[PDB]
Design a protein around this ligand. Structure first.
Ligand SMILES: Cc1cn2cc(C(F)(F)F)cc2c(=O)[nH]1
Length: 228
């Protein structure tokens, strides 16, 4: 009787959506934990709330790729207090790495406390608009995840990609249309942001919206193909 099944995405499971807890016995944001013991074996999973995590919403909504997988090196822009980062940390595991970039010092304290238990998280308490200031800390990454909310933030993501993202690496970008231009339609916003990505050789491969978890919110996944 398999109680928790591997999901199509490596490192993700269905029980609904859960990740394997990198720190058994501890929750990050009050989420339920499910520990399964058989003999001397024991594995714990943490529930992943699509109402607080746009990545979980996107997975439940059927995104084809997330590019966050065991061993991956991830640059996470807008890490906040670490809710989604904690699950990314679970997925990439001890051989992966998550750079958790966050501008707020208050949020940063939560990220620092989270990363005390998780070796694979590096809090970077800096303004992502100016990646030259922390470039010496960031090893080249496989995937960038970003929470974009202003009409200048796709460009911020791109500037980080140009500095940190490997050729042929990937990006996963959440777009809150209301925050980019509340006077535009969600479709005008999403089309405009996709255009900004393409201008920076960030080539979308898929996109989806996040109902019923969020209103007028899209996740765009794609591939970075800079010129020589
Ligand atoms: C909550 C939050 C979101 N965010 C998004 C960006 C980027 F501009 F890189 F997209 C940076 C941040 C950040 O420091 N905090």
């Amino acid at each position: 009787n398999v109680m928790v099944e591997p999901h199509r995405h490596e490192g993700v499971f269905i029980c609904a959506l859960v990740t394997k807890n990198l720190v058994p016995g501890e929750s990050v944001y009050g989420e339920k934990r499910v520990s399964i013991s058989e003999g001397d074996d024991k594995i714990e999973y943490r529930a992943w709330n699509p109402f607080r995590s746009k990545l979980a919403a996107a997975i439940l909504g059927g995104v084809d790729q997330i590019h966050i997988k065991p061993g991956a090196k991830v640059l996470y822009l807008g890490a906040a207090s670490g809710t989604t980062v904690s699950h990314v940390s679970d997925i990439v595991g001890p051989d992966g790495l998550v750079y958790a970039v966050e501008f707020s010092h208050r949020s940063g304290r939560d990220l620092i406390n989270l990363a005390k238990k998780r070796t694979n998280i590096i809090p970077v308490i800096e303004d992502a608009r100016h990646p030259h200031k922390y470039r010496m800390l960031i090893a080249m990454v496989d995937v960038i995840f970003a929470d974009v909310a202003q009409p200048d933030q796709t460009r911020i993501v791109a500037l980080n990609a140009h500095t940190f993202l490997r050729n042929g690496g990937h990006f996963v970008i959440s777009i809150k249309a209301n925050c980019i231009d509340s006077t535009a339609s969600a479709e005008a916003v999403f089309a405009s942001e996709v255009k900004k990505m393409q201008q920076e050789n960030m080539k979308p491969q898929e996109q989806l919206t996040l109902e019923p978890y969020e209103r007028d919110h899209a996740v765009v996944v794609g591939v970075y193909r800079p010129p020589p």
